[PDB]
């Protein structure tokens, strides 16, 4: 739909979409493959993780700039997530559990982020 994805990028988010954003975030941090996502990376789990990530980010830290209301726009909070899907893939090996987990997750966050879209648009 061009309504969808005219809205994406130049509707400024409401109120009414910041609670379709908490239910959509709200989902990812239940799925079970989203257990790497939920909390900031520990470096003692991961050497060296924030001197080769530019840009960390995590389910709490988004659950936080949503409840303050950070993004302005739709493509803002997509990019903040895409950052969570794109920093594992960028370290993790395409064998490991955490790789496998960011294609699960994404795979379930594209699935609920077109029908935030779609609710958007009626």
């Given at each position: 739909m061009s309504t969808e994805d005219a809205m994406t990028v130049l509707t400024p988010l409401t109120e009414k979409d910041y609670e379709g954003l908490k239910r959509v975030l709200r989902s990812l941090q239940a799925h079970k493959m989203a257990w790497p996502f939920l909390e900031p990376v520990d470096p003692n789990d991961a050497p060296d993780y924030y001197g080769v990530i530019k840009e960390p980010m995590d389910l709490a830290t988004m659950e936080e700039r949503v409840q303050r209301r950070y993004?302005?726009?739709?493509t803002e909070f997509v990019a903040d997530m895409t950052k969570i899907f794109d920093n594992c893939r960028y370290y993790?090996?395409?064998?490991?559990p955490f790789y496998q987990c960011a294609e699960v997750l994404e795979s379930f966050f594209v699935q609920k982020l077109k029908g935030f879209k779609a609710s958007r648009s009626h």
């Open positions: 993004y302005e726009k739709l993790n090996p395409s064998d490991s």
